[PDB]
Amino acid sequence: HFVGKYEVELKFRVMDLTTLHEQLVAQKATAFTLNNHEKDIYLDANGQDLAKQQISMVLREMNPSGIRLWIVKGPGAERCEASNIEDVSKVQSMLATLGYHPAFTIEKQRSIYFVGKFHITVDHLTGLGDFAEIAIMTDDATELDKLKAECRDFANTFGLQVDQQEPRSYRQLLGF
Amino acid sequence: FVGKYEVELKFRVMDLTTLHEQLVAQKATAFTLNNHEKDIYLDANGQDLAKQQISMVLREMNPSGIRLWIVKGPGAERCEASNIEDVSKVQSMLATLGYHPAFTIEKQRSIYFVGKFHITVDHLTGLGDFAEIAIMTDDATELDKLKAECRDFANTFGLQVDQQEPRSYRQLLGF
Numbered sequence: 001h002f003v004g005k006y007e008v009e010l011k012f013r014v015m016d017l018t019t020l021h022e023q024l025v026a027q028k029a030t031a032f033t034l035n036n037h038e039k040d041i042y043l044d045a046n047g048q049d050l051a052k053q054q055i056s057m058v059l060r061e062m063n064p065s066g067i068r069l070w071i072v073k074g075p076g077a078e079r080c081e082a083s084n085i086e087d088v089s090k091v092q093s094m095l096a097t098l099g100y101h102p103a104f105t106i107e108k109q110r111s112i113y114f115v116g117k118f119h120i121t122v123d124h125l126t127g128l129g130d131f132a133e134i135a136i137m138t139d140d141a142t143e144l145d146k147l148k149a150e151c152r153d154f155a156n157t158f159g160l161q162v163d164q165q166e167p168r169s170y171r172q173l174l175g176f
Numbered sequence: 177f178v179g180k181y182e183v184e185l186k187f188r189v190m191d192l193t194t195l196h197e198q199l200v201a202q203k204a205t206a207f208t209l210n211n212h213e214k215d216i217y218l219d220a221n222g223q224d225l226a227k228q229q230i231s232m233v234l235r236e237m238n239p240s241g242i243r244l245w246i247v248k249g250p251g252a253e254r255c256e257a258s259n260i261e262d263v264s265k266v267q268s269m270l271a272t273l274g275y276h277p278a279f280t281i282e283k284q285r286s287i288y289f290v291g292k293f294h295i296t297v298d299h300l301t302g303l304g305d306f307a308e309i310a311i312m313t314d315d316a317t318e319l320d321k322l323k324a325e326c327r328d329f330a331n332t333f334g335l336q337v338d339q340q341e342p343r344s345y346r347q348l349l350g351f
């Protein structure tokens with residue numbers, strides 16, 4: 001389900017959580033993770049070498065699923081790769097040796113569901129609110145426009161309207 | 177293999193038979209035997225890591241199936257590794273960060289344990305046979321205690337100063 005070097009993703013503010021959850025049942029979504037606490041440690045060089053390339057690098061821990069991930073997003077839009085890791089602090093220390101250090105941390109509650117080829121995330125960030133992301137990962141750059149349009153259609157199906165789309169990342173929304 | 181530091185002493189081995197008797201006597205436990213290890217070393221285009229006494233390796237060990245991402249340095253004691261699922265996925269991620277294959281080192285390796293010590297027995301084409309006595313630690317404030325203990329172990333094991341090799345494999349191979 002998570003296979004690819006491209007991730008096409010749309011983020012929406014969630015105005016009506018009830019309708020979203022009702023649609024997740026109607027469409028027989030399968031829960032991949034439920035109400036996990038997700039702590040993301042963002043890493044960069046002293047001089048923000050990665051941000052200057054529109055790269056983000058994250059070590060993610062999700063509890064109680066026990067998933068731990070090293071994620072490199074970028075450079076620029078729609079590029080994303082991730083690896084499962086056994087130990088966040090181990091990889092964090094390895095990356096510190098290479099010059100990458102904790103820049104800030106983002107915490108959220110997140111559930112992840114699958115419906116056919118699509119992933120749908122339902123997120124809550126203290127102080128910011130409720131969001132949902134609709135995404136599909138692919139290795140094929142030739143269908144990215146089609147895939148993004150399919151995500152927008154799919155989202156509408158959960159009550160997520162064109163006008164609730166949020167182009168800013170959580171890092172941007174949190175002032176980082 | 178728990179730690180940030182690998183305290184080691186490396187030796188050329190002149191007689192594998194004596195080593196193998198050296199081993200048996202001391203009741204060594206086999207950990208992995210006769211694995212082909214292929215190490216891809218990565219660096220930035222300006223050899224940025226090497227200029228810092230750092231090496232970064234993706235290691236594949238067959239037939240054990242073990243795959244490791246290793247960051248060594250700065251210097252010859254600091255060492256950390258993480259088991260990885262998919263070598264090509266990690267290599268691509270590191271490529272995004274600007275690290276790309278620089279050279280490859282291959283060897284045959286066997287790893288044995290005698291108590292807290294690891295004894296690694298290596299063969300490299302042309303270069304020959306080597307053995308390393310090693311102890312891992314997380315605590316730099318005990319590096320002295322351990323390097324002494326390695327020396328005492330190597331002495332009672334019969335690996336002698338005249339056979340010591342202070343150079344890394346990359347140094348021996350001119351990389």
Ligand SMILES: Nc1ncnc2c1ncn2[C@@H]1O[C@H](COP(=O)(O)OP(=O)(O)OP(=O)(O)O)C[C@H]1O
Binds near residue numbers: 007040071082084135
């Ligand atoms: N279990 C997993 N295995 C492999 N890849 C995964 C896994 N879970 C998520 N990923 C991938 O890693 C990427 C993580 O980015 P994402 O979760 O979108 O960040 P975020 O917290 O939503 O912040 P943004 O606002 O999108 O920057 C998205 C997804 O395609």
Ligand SMILES: Nc1ncnc2c1ncn2[C@@H]1O[C@H](COP(=O)(O)OP(=O)(O)OP(=O)(O)O)C[C@H]1O
Binds near residue numbers: 177242258344346
């Ligand atoms: N199975 C394993 N799990 C975790 N770490 C391991 C495992 N096997 C070996 N390691 C660690 O990786 C380290 C790699 O360094 P090492 O194996 O000494 O490199 P080398 O090929 O002998 O080259 P040098 O000449 O020593 O620089 C050593 C050890 O601390």
Ligand SMILES: [Mn+2]
Binds near residue numbers: 009
């Ligand atoms: Mn996202």
Ligand SMILES: [Mn+2]
Binds near residue numbers: 308
């Ligand atoms: Mn060694």
